[PDB]
Amino acid sequence: TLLRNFGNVYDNPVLLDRSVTAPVTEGFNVVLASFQALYLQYQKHHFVVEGSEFYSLHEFFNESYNQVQDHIHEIGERLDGLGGVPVATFSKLAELTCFEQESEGVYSSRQMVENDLAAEQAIIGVIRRQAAQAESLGDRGTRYLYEKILLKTEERAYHLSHFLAKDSLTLGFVQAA
Amino acid sequence: TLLRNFGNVYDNPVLLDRSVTAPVTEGFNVVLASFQALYLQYQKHHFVVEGSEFYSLHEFFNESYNQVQDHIHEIGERLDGLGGVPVATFSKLAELTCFEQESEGVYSSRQMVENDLAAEQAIIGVIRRQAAQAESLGDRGTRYLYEKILLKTEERAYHLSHFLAKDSLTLGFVQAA
Amino acid sequence: TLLRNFGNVYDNPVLLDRSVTAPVTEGFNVVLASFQALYLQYQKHHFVVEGSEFYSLHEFFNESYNQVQDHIHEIGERLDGLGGVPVATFSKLAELTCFEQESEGVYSSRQMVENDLAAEQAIIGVIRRQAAQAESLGDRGTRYLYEKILLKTEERAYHLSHFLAKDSLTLGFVQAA
Amino acid sequence: TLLRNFGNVYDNPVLLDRSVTAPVTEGFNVVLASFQALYLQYQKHHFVVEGSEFYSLHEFFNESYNQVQDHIHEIGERLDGLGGVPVATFSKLAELTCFEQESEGVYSSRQMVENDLAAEQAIIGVIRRQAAQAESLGDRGTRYLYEKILLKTEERAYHLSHFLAKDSLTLGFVQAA
Amino acid sequence: TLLRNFGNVYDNPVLLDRSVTAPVTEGFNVVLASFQALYLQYQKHHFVVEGSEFYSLHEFFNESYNQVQDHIHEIGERLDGLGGVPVATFSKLAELTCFEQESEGVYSSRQMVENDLAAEQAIIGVIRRQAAQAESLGDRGTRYLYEKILLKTEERAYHLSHFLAKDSLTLGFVQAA
Amino acid sequence: QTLLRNFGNVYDNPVLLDRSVTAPVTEGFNVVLASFQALYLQYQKHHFVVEGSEFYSLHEFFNESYNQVQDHIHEIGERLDGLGGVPVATFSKLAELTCFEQESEGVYSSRQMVENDLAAEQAIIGVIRRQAAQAESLGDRGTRYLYEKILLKTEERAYHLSHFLAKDSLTLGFVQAA
Amino acid sequence: TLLRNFGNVYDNPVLLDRSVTAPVTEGFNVVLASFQALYLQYQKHHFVVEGSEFYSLHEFFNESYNQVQDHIHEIGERLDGLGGVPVATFSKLAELTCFEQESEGVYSSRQMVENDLAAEQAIIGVIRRQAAQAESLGDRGTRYLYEKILLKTEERAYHLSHFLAKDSLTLGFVQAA
Amino acid sequence: QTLLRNFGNVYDNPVLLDRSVTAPVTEGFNVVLASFQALYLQYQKHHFVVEGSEFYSLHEFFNESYNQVQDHIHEIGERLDGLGGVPVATFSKLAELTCFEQESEGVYSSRQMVENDLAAEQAIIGVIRRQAAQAESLGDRGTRYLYEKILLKTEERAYHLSHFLAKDSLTLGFVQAA
């Protein structure tokens, strides 16, 4: 039998008003869903990436989804700790994610990296909003956690950006443009 | 711009006929989807489990979904390697999983363990069928990998089953049902 | 073709008289046999324990028989080193153990813990007598080794005793006996 | 009070018929008893081995019984997991072991190594039979586990065999035959 | 003077008939020679690869010949354990390898990867035949070992083919052929 | 205010080497020290800014390289001081003593960066060989030995830099050659 | 030819306006140059410190420039990630550092520690201003990074001042000034 | 089809060494490389097949030895390529360049195996000394240094092999001497 209903906030032990934990946990579920989406996508990319820079990308994608997994772990624990109910079903994850998952099929290396950067950017957008919200509502712990996650997420965005730059060692001996 | 379509099977570099890799990768995708559902469910259980045995269950659920992650990693890489396209969207995962995920909301610790046991049992059935199939098709690597995963999956079932046994130290001093 | 007969005591290289090594190695063999029985019983308990506290007990029993293995290793080597012949057959182990092993079959988790506590207590009595004897005979190394083992053995008894205490978090919400 | 009787099979959570788990767990108990016997014997040999190649043998015997201990651990857990009751008393272990333990007393290095090889060979015999049985009954997990154990056991047999070979560096300067 | 002649099989301590160990060891020598050839080739590629993706290839080749070295170790020891005589001279290695080594000289990155893939594929064919043989002859340990090695060898093949795929991040800004 | 050692001078050493040995040895160490600081800064810069299709490999390589150069600096700086010399540490003096000129401010292409690093390693290799030979001739075996340890790693970095630059690529199978 | 000109800011992939990244990267370069100067100085002090407390100071200076190196790494990578061009030439480093390096020569232990403290204090002033700026401009990641670095930098300042305190064990038996 | 470097030739190096230096240096490296591959194969074989009363010690020693030889091979092969040479890798060419002949196929006694390994190490020691001296005379300090590192380990293996062969044993207390 059910103890907590999804969408409802329950007691927390850290002296935060339910007026604070409801929107904080609501936003946490959006970020949790989004990161689950991005974890699945990075993992997919790890599985399917091919081509001349395969080895670097394949290693990068693995590091990336490990890092995202750590974000998910911290968010889910805190979300529950604050009395929230974390999303876990495919259908609801799809509803709450803040970006559109890459379609089934295998795309090119460049497209995968572009897809991942766009996803990271959508998440960066949400985290900045939820961090500001937490700060305004007086939830320092949440504000600080988001900023830790933000910094790593911005870093992944920088790294993806560098993969995409129009430079290569091959330009010294291949036809440009 | 796609490079490989989902549901299609492409060339492999390990000298296996398409008549082998088509059903094998089809099966891998079912198992991959099922393990993703189970990973999400174990992780949810890690986040939300409470009560007297919370610490033990919390740890157990964490270890369990980490182990399921390792299965996912091995299956997905091999699936792609055999020329298949691994499933990664929420909608398709929902379609291919061999058990139905626990509904959103928080259930009792006993119900969660029961839900995880039913899930492993569903997966055990699928793995045994896929292993037999790989054997009869001459894909030893796949059969062997399934048996490695099967052994760990049976062990998780053993452990879940032990959590559910109607015995406790507390029976020494509490009223039995 | 034998080199040393069981029940006989031979020369040692540590300048101790046979009047010392005979009872000392006799005692070591009792303790060795008892610890083998306890190792087997702890290991059995690790294999079969189930119920609400299964995970904790499972871990505890594993740690316990690993620790008992270390005692066995130290005793057996020293026993041989002092010119004695260490017991190793099932029949003789049964004869020399200072407590009776739990019968075949699976008992409740409470009964197992109680059985392990009685076993440690039996061994505690024997170790204290053997330590006193070594002291009075002038075998400091043996006395010291027994005290090292005694300290760990008392600690296991403490822990077992704590498992059996009539307290639980569940008393907050279940009917007490 | 007893929950499970020895010799009886109980429920398992891995969808194996009791017609399968009864003979599988019966055979597991034979192998478990045999390995316990061989563990005690290797340990004894570690304790008592003497002579010019003492140091190598003494280290080898220790590695060997550590390895056997790992076999015992896997077998006992799976045996219980399948609903069986693992043997743990001296008397019953003696009844189920598939080889005769070395008699009490200290034998020569060569005899100990011969005794250990004969024991490994008796166990190899049983494991091949139980592996074939498991395969025939549809218990892949058990078949695979046995084959893992078989490989390590065959390896110990090879190593024991090499200790026994009639070659030595000493032959360059000692009287042969 | 000799103790074992090459091309002959002697006694083994694991109770297998020489009707089993003769074809099995003969097969192991073909696989052993093939892996030595592949080890030499991967290591060469590690030494000499240059170009824009040099660093990744360099690492991959290193990991690959390390893994091949591990297969060699297991095969050689078991070959001998089963009573066979393992090949070790340049001349016989050349004779027994199931593929032809790349010629002396430094080839292009792509050619090197193509050569390594062709070698892995030749070896996969032999292993599958040898594993089937071992299964038919009742040598489970050998069948199981081949399967362990097969899985890793197939994985190397996947990785190599991924290197060869006609995709690159550079396609965003260089002229396609 | 008060100085224990003045820059440009050589003080007593505790390892029984004459000033006729330690003066030129420590002078050379200061050139090599300055050069490696310049290279460390350059590799680190390259680590920060490299981008493009092989960014990931180059990123890692540049990081490994400047960590290695850091180890060289540590050994040299300690022995220099040990032999009675005063190691350089100011920006202007480092600029004066370095045996190659640093890449200008700005971000260059991956290829240009690797070329710049290789030319830098080559200048340093030249100095190290000359300084090793001098140490050998002057009887300072410890210094000769240290230089050879560092030389071997420095040559290895040059080899790897050279390999990055080679006109070969997996992409040549499906892109138009120059 | 150039891809990015020093003194200019380019695009970033973390959705920040160049009205934010221009002052933020300009600030990062001042801090980066200051830390390079401090790194060089600590390392110098590590090389040259001598005297009665040499060994402790030697260790401390080593730990300190290692920690400064870590700040440099984070700042440089983020500076670039935000689309700025990080300083690296001796000449521009001299121009941008917020404190003046100690002059060439070996100073007293006390003077060295005083110089390092004055440098840390100059850097603390800049960091606090730059952190405030970043907060005002909406760059949380930068604000947070500066705070991480600030805490360690303040800690180094505490430690340095502790070195300078007019207390010593020697005051029990030497003449105070 | 198309070759970047042809075997037997020396290409440009990035460490400012003349061809008059790198040609003989890399030629010698290829001999030492071939020899160590032969020794690696032999030690590994000995690891696989050694049996008898001291099997356990010899087993371990042979494993340690071929792992060490592997490290030598790795360093040599990389520097050889680095200096512009082409490292040998085919069975027939390895057979041609090795400085000792491999033990014949078959399993020999423990004593014969150790003797064979010692004779092999001794042949390689001879070559390494000559090649080190050449490198020294030609100005290649890095190569000279590397050879000396490897020489020292190789001599240590020879020492241990020699100790295995000594006519002494704990068993002499209770068995009949020859």
Added chain:
Amino acid sequence: TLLRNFGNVYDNPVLLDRSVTAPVTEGFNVVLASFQALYLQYQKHHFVVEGSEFYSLHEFFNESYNQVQDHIHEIGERLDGLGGVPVATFSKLAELTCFEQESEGVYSSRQMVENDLAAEQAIIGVIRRQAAQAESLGDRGTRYLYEKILLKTEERAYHLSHFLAKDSLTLGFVQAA
């Protein structure tokens, strides 16, 4: 509600008479309180020590209170194991400690080291008394534990003593007395 009252001894599982455990646990509480006092004091000293030998002292004080913490851990567990109730309130700790805590405020390095030595000496006094008591009452485990702790405590006393010795490298160039 209270289960055990402070000052009262309860059941133990190690077959020691309450006539033994009462004075043993009473003495353990004195030593526990004393070590808590000395832990707080070493920690304080770690926090506040300044001056020319600051770095060494600061590291020494940290090692020292880590070591004391380990003593406290062993004592508290055994104390409870023997059926005693360990002290934990500020007021009662103050009552039972065997030395007077250093007053609030920061003292000189020499004074701190003198204060710590005097504290260690008071504790050494008590441990020797309680060890003799345990020996006389037949509690070997306790006697042995005290002697382990004694040895480390004597060692800290030696080290403190050395800090205080009237020798210094500075005497070669500073005015003595």
Added chain:
Amino acid sequence: TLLRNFGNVYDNPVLLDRSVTAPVTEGFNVVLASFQALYLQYQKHHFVVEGSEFYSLHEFFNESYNQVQDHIHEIGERLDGLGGVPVATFSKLAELTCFEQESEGVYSSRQMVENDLAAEQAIIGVIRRQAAQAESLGDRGTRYLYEKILLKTEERAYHLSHFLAKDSLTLGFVQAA
């Protein structure tokens, strides 16, 4: 000039009378000198042992002088801590050692092991006398330290005697004396 004269005992900070520390430190110096002699001898044996069992002996001698080095460290530090002056010159070491070092030259493996055993036995005699003395004088820490060292020293003696036993694998195919 001197701070402590050899042969005299000074103050200690662990509240022991000099009637205790004088005989105890005098004893520690005899044991210290004996262990230095033994350390030198084991190390020599490590350098020079050759023959068929060379490799095992080589390892054993290394382990042994490492362990002796550990005894030396503990004894030296406590000797000084108790206010004594530890021996360190070749001449006085020769004078104080309780056994005579093996002569210069390389002896047989068996002779070396016999010499090492005789040395261990001489040291065992001293330690037992010194431990008894320390117990009688009320120096528990010293008594306990000697017992720790005694146990390891006895263990080395067992191992050495095992090397000397007239048994060997070679007795199966070589002529017994």
Added chain:
Amino acid sequence: QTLLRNFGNVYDNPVLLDRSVTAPVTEGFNVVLASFQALYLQYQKHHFVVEGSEFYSLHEFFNESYNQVQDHIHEIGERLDGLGGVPVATFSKLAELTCFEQESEGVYSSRQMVENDLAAEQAIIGVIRRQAAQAESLGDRGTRYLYEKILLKTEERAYHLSHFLAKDSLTLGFVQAA
């Protein structure tokens, strides 16, 4: 009773070096071995007995130092035996061969201890350089190389000892100078 090697003599070696090389090389190794045993004992003593305001640093340094010296001893003793020599191990012969005299029994000041250790390192440095040069001239590159490895660490210990002795201190800010 029966000896396999007699002290003072050189036996066959398995690394193809003539007795004209191994006799003086192993003779020198025995002097350096004896000297390091003496230094090991001294550093260890200093570890045990050092006290005073800088006791903690000196304590650690002396421990690190004698562990390092132990490593030197291990390498030397093994190569000495390997080359066919007989390593010294008795107190009286160690006393005869050591190249410096041990500090007398008793506890000296921190400063005197550091001075004694430095003088000891300097004596050993002198011997090592002479023995390295001899090995070089005799064609024993492995021995020359080993000495240089050890020399470099030994010189580093001398540098650190020298730094302990320098007339500088944080205390000079508030205590009366000499």
